[PDB]
Amino acid sequence: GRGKLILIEGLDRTGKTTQCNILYKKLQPNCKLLKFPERSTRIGGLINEYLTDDSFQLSDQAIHLLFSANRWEIVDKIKKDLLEGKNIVMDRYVYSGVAYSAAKGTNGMDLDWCLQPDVGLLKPDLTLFLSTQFGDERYETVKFQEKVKQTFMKLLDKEIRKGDESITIVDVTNKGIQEVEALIWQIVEPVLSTHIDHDKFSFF
Amino acid sequence: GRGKLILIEGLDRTGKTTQCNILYKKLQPNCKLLKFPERSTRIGGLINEYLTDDSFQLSDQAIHLLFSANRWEIVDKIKKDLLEGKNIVMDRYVYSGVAYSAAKGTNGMDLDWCLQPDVGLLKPDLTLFLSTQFGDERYETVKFQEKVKQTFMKLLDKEIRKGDESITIVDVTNKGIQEVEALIWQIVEPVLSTHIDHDKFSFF
Ligand SMILES: Cc1cn([C@H]2C[C@H](N=[N+]=[N-])[C@@H](COP(=O)(O)O)O2)c(=O)[nH]c1=O
Ligand SMILES: Cc1cn([C@H]2C[C@H](N=[N+]=[N-])[C@@H](COP(=O)(O)O)O2)c(=O)[nH]c1=O
């Protein structure tokens, strides 16, 4: 059938980018690697500013919508590649979008408001949340990181309770690159082997 | 009390801009003129490139979000000016954002989805819709405007059912600058007198 959309979510420095590259290289040549935010586009450009320069002041709602817009500008290419039989591994997506913004506790910006902009976007066939027991960019402070992990758990737990079986939480506490690799593969392989119709897609 | 938020909506070439400038000169010195989209900012610049150059390709969902983000990056200063007693004349706001986008008929982008990103925004104290019974920018085509007109009507008609009385539909057909001005004023003057508490606002 069509390729699979695999997502790996988690806190900055949990081994996310590494396991993504590892999974990507192991799925060649019919696999593409996608990173969010996608900083090479014009919208991704303002997102890069915001994250690397605090003089660039932008309200919480504005930057939030830019992050969702950034996914919407690329989504059509994703759907296309999947149809051409290629697999796609993503480093962050909708879940990071909601969590990092909701952890701020800004008036009006709760979990539900935060998701809305992303409603209609392609939903991953499988989402892996890597969890455990710098400072260059805006959200890089131990105190904030603790809050987003709290929100992440709140969000995912809600979705799983609601019946979403495509979400799997992997505890990578004190485990090596290859042990974590084996854990992830133990989960992804069986989904790569299931046949999915070209016409079947899930959306947020 | 606080200054009042006055909004004038409508189709391109309905006299909307000239009326806003007339009202502004009439409320000055204690008044500010604000136009959306505000193409002065970085996000506004992206909006501008999309509207002035059809070479610039961007998904409907992505541009829609940039339009909302453009409002969200200015709203704090709007609120601030009202608290200091200054009145604000606004040329286009969230109604244009929902109408011009839902008119496209793109799958998933209905009146509902289109409104979500603007939820939580300061609702204007008075909304005047200029109704009637160029070509160097995107959207500026006779066939599209017809769709936008019918979209505005369905939207505004909806808000009326819900109980919003701040929306007034002013028919400007075959009328001159001065006559329309008189109509606008007969609706604006009352509101400008009505006492509004320093901290009372309506939101979307
Ligand atoms: C994709 C995405 C990431 N982010 C943040 C997470 C990251 N914050 N930190 N630390 C930041 C940069 O991400 P990367 O380090 O993964 O490039 O963007 C959001 O706020 N929303 C989103 O939609
Ligand atoms: C403020 C705003 C304007 N628009 C469109 C309306 C106008 N369309 N045409 N033709 C366009 C530019 O309007 P102005 O000429 O008033 O600058 O922006 C939206 O699509 N959504 C919005 O949120």
Curated annotation (Swiss-Prot), chains A, B:
GO terms for biological process: dTDP biosynthetic process; dTTP biosynthetic process; dUDP biosynthetic process. It catalyses: dTMP + ATP = dTDP + ADP. GO terms for molecular function: ATP binding; dTMP kinase activity; nucleoside diphosphate kinase activity; UMP/dUMP kinase activity. Coiled coil: none annotated. CDD domains: TMPK. Present with 2980 molecules/cell in log phase SD medium. Homodimer. InterPro entries: P-loop_NTPase (IPR027417), Thymidylate_kin-like_dom (IPR039430), Thymidylate_kin_CS (IPR018095), Thymidylate_kinase (IPR018094). Catalyzes the conversion of dTMP to dTDP. GO terms for cellular component: cytoplasm; nucleus. Keywords: ATP-binding, Kinase, Nucleotide biosynthesis, Nucleotide-binding, Transferase. Pathway: Pyrimidine metabolism; dTTP biosynthesis. It is an enzyme of class 2 (transferase). ATP binds at G10, L11, D12, R13, T14, G15, K16, T17. Its EC number is 2.7.4.9. Pfam families: Thymidylate_kin. The keyword Magnesium does not apply. It comes from Saccharomyces cerevisiae (strain ATCC 204508 / S288c). Belongs to the thymidylate kinase family. This is Thymidylate kinase.
